[PDB]
Each structure stands twice: as C-alpha cells, then as structure tokens.
Ligand binder design. Structure first.
Ligand SMILES: *C/C=C(C)/C=C/C=C(C)/C=C/C1=C(C)CCCC1(C)C
Ligand SMILES: *C/C=C(C)/C=C/C=C(C)/C=C/C1=C(C)CCCC1(C)C
Ligand SMILES: *C/C=C(C)/C=C/C=C(C)/C=C/C1=C(C)CCCC1(C)C
Lengths: 223, 223, 223
C-alpha cells in the first residue's frame, strides 16, 4: 500500500530481534547494577518494536492538513521517543553515576524536546511547525550540552571509556533526527516520506540496538 | 440507558468506599515503609473510582468501527490500568525489596501490556486487534514470570507469606483479563458487553480492594 | 483574533524570561541538593512556556459542545499542570525531606486533581462538568491538608522558614484556580474567557516564577 511499508516492516523485525537478543543475553544476570542496564536497554527496542508495528499496520499514522495538502504524519514515532529517549539518557546518566538533579534536567528537557516535536508534527499552520522544531532543537542542544559539560576523578576507566563511546554515538545519531524532520514530510517536504522512513529506521535501529550492543557488551555495566 | 450501567455504578461505589476505607485506615500511620504501602494502595482504587465514574457518565466510552459495526469501547479502562497496574506491581516489588532493575522491568513490561491492549481496543482492522492482544498477553506472561522467578534467604517470614498470597491473587485475577477481553466486545464478541462489564467489575474490585485489604491488614508493610 | 491573545502572549514571554533567568542563575551550581531544586524549578516555567505558546498559536485550544453552544476550551493548561504541579509539590516535599510515601500521595492526588479537571473541562453534559470539578477540588483539599498536617524537630531553621513561606504562597494561589474555573468559561461562564485568561496568567506566573524566585534565592536549597 504505502511505499515506506518495507522500511517499517524491517524496522519492526530488527527491533523485535534486538529485544529478544537482549532479553536472552540478560538472563542469569544477578548483579544489581547490570540488571538496571539490561532492563533499560531491553525495554527501549521493545517499545520501538510496538510503535514500528503500529506504523506498519497503519494505526500510528494520521493525516494533518497544511500547505494545502493532506500530509501523512506518523505520530507513533513520538509515542515511541517519549519513552525511549529518556530511557537512553538514563543509561548514560547511570553509567556515570549522575546526581538526581542532572537526571531530572535531562529527562525533563527530553520530554520537552519530544513534546514540542509532536506539537510541530500535528500543527496545521505551516510556518508554526518550524517554530516548534526550533524549540525542540534548542532542547536537544541543551541535552547535548549537559552530556558534554554536565564525576571524572572518581570514575572507573571502563566506565569513562564506554560512556565516551556511547556519548559520541548519541550526539551524532540524535543530531540527525532534526535534520531529517526538517527536510522530510513533517517539514519542508523536499525528501519523500519513503526515504524519510528509511532514514529514521537506520537511525532508530542504530541508536537503540547498536547503542544497546555496545553498552551490554561492556564491563562498565557491572559493579 | 446502557444495560451495563448498573455494574459501572456498583463499581464506582465500591471503588469509592474502598478508597475512603483505606484513607481512614491509613490515618496516624507514621512508619515510613507502611506509609508507602498505604499511599500506593489507596491511590489504586481512587484512580479506579474516577475511571469507573468516567464510564458511568459516558465520558470514557467511544465507538470503534470494525467487523462492520459500531462497537462501544470503554477506553477509560486503559487510562485506569495504565496507572493502577504498575502501582499494584510496585506494592509487590517493595514488599520483597526488589532491586530497581527488576522494578523497571515490571513497570515497563506493564506499560507495554496496557499500551498494546489500548491499541488493540481501538484498532479498526478486526484481525489486527488480536495481534495486539497477543503482544499484550506476552508482556503479561513476562510479568507473571518475573513475579515467580525474579531475596529469599534474608526475607522476613511475614513478608514472604503475604507476598506469596498477594502473588497468587495477582496471577489468578490478572490472567482472567485477557480471556474476558478476548471473548468480550473488544474481541470475538461472544459475550455481551453488559456481562463483560460485570466480569471486569468483579475482577477490578477484587484485584484492587480485595488485594488492598489483604496487604494493609498484614504486618509485612511495617519495618 | 481572540481577545485573550494579549494575556497568552504576555504569559508566553514571562514564562520564557523566567526560564532563561533560572537557567542562567543555576549555572555553576555544584551542590547536589541545589541542583535538584534548580532542575525542578527551571523545568516548571519551561513547560509552561511551551503550553502558553501552544495556546497563543491556537494549538492548545478546542471547542467543546455544552449548554447549547460551542465553548472554547484551552486544554493545553492541563497538559501544563499535569507536569508542573507535581514538580512544584516535589520542590516543597524535597525541601522538608518528606518520605517517599508522602511524596507519592501528593503526586498521585495531584494527578487525580488535574486529570479530573481535564475530564470536567471536556465533558459535554453541563451538570457533570461540576461533578468532576468537585472531585478535583476534593483532591486539591487533600493536597493542602497534607502540606499542613503531613520533620520539625530535626529541621534547619532556613528550611522551615522558606517552606512555610512557599507553603502559604501555594495554598493561596492554588486555591484560586478552582474558583476561576468555576466562574469562568469552563464552568458557570459568568466571567468572560479573556478575563479568565488574564486571571490564570497572573496566577500561573506567580505560582511558577514568583514561587521560583523565592525558592532559588533561599539558602535552604543548599545542603
Ligand atoms: C530511538 C530514537 C531516538 C534516539 C530518537 C531521537 C529523537 C530526537 C533527538 C528528535 C529530535 C527532534 C528535534 C530536535 C527537532 C524537532 C523534531 C524532532 C522531534 C525529530
Ligand atoms: C485494576 C486492574 C487490574 C489489576 C487489571 C489488570 C489488567 C490486565 C492484566 C490486562 C491484560 C490484557 C492482556 C494480557 C491482553 C490484552 C487485553 C488486556 C489489556 C485486557
Ligand atoms: C502553574 C500552575 C499551577 C500551580 C496550577 C494549579 C492548578 C490547580 C490547583 C487546579 C485545580 C482545579 C481544581 C481544584 C478544580 C477543578 C479545576 C482545576 C483543574 C482548575
């Protein structure tokens, strides 16, 4: 039906397999700290799996009028990210034993990032969609700022090493989302929805399963 | 108006009385641990009370097209369960001093269970509704698994005893929900909505007020 | 377009400036406890900023049929309060080192207060709107009760002093909301929407930025 269906189907399959792999791999783990990381990390692709399935079956898709056309908007992505992005930030924060204040700042700014992105995606006045994109981007920039300038002296080498790798993976991949949104169907519409869907699938799988494989294979998750 | 109104009214009344009873019973409690259990346990029927009232007044009801008919779907149940089921799991987890990793696993899987159940309840393609039911059921099975195989050596007798009772009550009652959904109006439609509503009221009151009476009368909630 | 636009624009500007001020003021803070208070306190007007902008641009506004008319209902307020009121209660609770049980009681009752207020705001049967208002008010009264009768012996003077001031500010300002709602467009409609919007803007800015200035200038936030 929809040309982007193949990418949604592949996304569903990859998130599903990733979830199952992490689920199996986490069996037997008794270390409290490691359990936290496995729980957070397995839940991420499990949620993504449900939302990709939602998009594939057509439930997480809605039509938004703007620019004089009926624009297909997959709102299920925000329902996904609303829960998965904060969880991913939690993995990074727990890894460096961040204090509660910083965790709340990250989670709250993340909520603002996704919430304003959702508002922008459903906004009927074309020009306003970009106002929301700008605010969401400012929130993302705040998050990236905190990750880099927001624990070193008393920090295990493996912890510092894995955190630096996951932080770099996060900054690169997350930074791409606003660009894809901006040039894709939710924004300027210069890149067709099918290609946009492919881009998000690669980004999502990398930011979730890729990110997860790196974290769960590290000894940093253990006390 | 709607034949199932009597069960919604009785459900509203029972949840309301249960809330008031727990509220009174919890007065004077100074023990920190006991306070946690009273807060969690009183909030559960208070939330259920609001959603049952929502259904009674008709606000938590919507019409979903599928199978060639306008099907009355009480979505308010998911708004209820989304918050009450995780809270109930929290009572069980705190009772056994479960570690954060396991708590997150339970809460996250519970969110998936209710979220996919909601998607299934509102899905317009009949066959797909059952795909969502299957995923939600898999999440429930994971939860039941964790409760039984997911703390013994260093565990007070009263704690182990009450937990085992509440765990058995939980497995039996919770396991009935997917069956009721499957044969009821949201699924195969072989059992009429009025009878389905009665079933859920008995299950809800038992899983909330019944469950609550057992927990709050035990000495396990005290340090 | 809408006469109340000026108050929404001023509200947007004030919440935005307040957010920026708190953001700057919180720079350099290394004290863990102080970080918690700055995070919570800065997030509050940041969220309010987004929802006021939502109302200004028209996204957070919907039409609800009741009383034989199309009533303009700004639902964005509840999306705001759903997150900001619990955060404000968290500031007060952390300030007095409240135990988890009491925190959950406050947060849960707050959720009920806002959730039932939202249901009332969107209810099509006029008389029922007031039933929801009554339940929401009962939840607010419970919260006010807990704040006054729910830690003294072992409590720093500055902490007790600032808490008492913020508690008084909270009881006075919060108590006004149900009155405004009752006499405003969501209720009896005796006070026009434009005036109602002005009232909420003054209350919101005072309960958020005013409240925030008092808290963040106190030494109580430091360990
Ligand atoms: C599993 C998914 C991940 C890690 C998704 C990350 C999403 C973002 C960083 C999204 C950010 C956006 C903006 C900064 C601007 C507005 C549009 C968004 C929501 C695509
Ligand atoms: C107070 C209510 C309780 C304890 C409700 C429990 C609800 C469930 C365990 C629901 C589970 C469902 C499935 C496993 C399959 C799909 C349909 C549901 C949501 C009814
Ligand atoms: C930043 C906003 C604040 C501090 C808002 C406070 C909101 C309330 C205390 C609202 C309470 C209401 C009731 C008690 C009755 C029903 C209507 C409401 C939601 C306006």
């Amino acid at each position: 039906g929809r040309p982007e269906w193949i990418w949604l189907a592949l996304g569903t399959a990859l998130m599903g397999l990733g979830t199952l792999y992490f689920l199996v791999k986490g069996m037997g783990v008794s270390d409290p700290d490691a359990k936290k990381f496995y729980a957070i990390t397995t839940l991420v692709p499990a949620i993504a799996f449900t939302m990709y399935l939602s998009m594939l079956l057509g439930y997480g898709l809605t039509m938004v009028p703007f620019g004089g056309e009926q624009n297909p908007i997959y709102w299920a992505r925000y329902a996904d990210w609303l829960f998965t992005t904060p969880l991913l930030l939690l993995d990074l924060a727990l890894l460096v034993d961040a204090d509660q204040g910083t965790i709340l700042a990250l989670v709250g700014a993340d909520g603002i990032m996704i919430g304003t992105g959702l508002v922008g995606a459903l906004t009927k006045v074309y020009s306003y969609r970009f106002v929301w994109w700008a605010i969401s981007t400012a929130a993302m920039l705040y998050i990236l700022y905190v990750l880099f300038f927001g624990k070193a002296e008393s920090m295990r080498p493996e912890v510092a090493s894995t955190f630096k790798v996951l932080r770099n993976v996060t900054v690169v991949l997350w930074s791409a989302y606003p660009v894809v949104w901006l040039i894709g169907s939710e924004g300027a519409g210069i890149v067709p929805l099918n290609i946009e869907t492919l881009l998000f699938m690669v980004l999502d799988v990398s930011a979730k399963v890729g990110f997860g494989l790196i974290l769960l294979r590290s000894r940093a998750i253990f006390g």
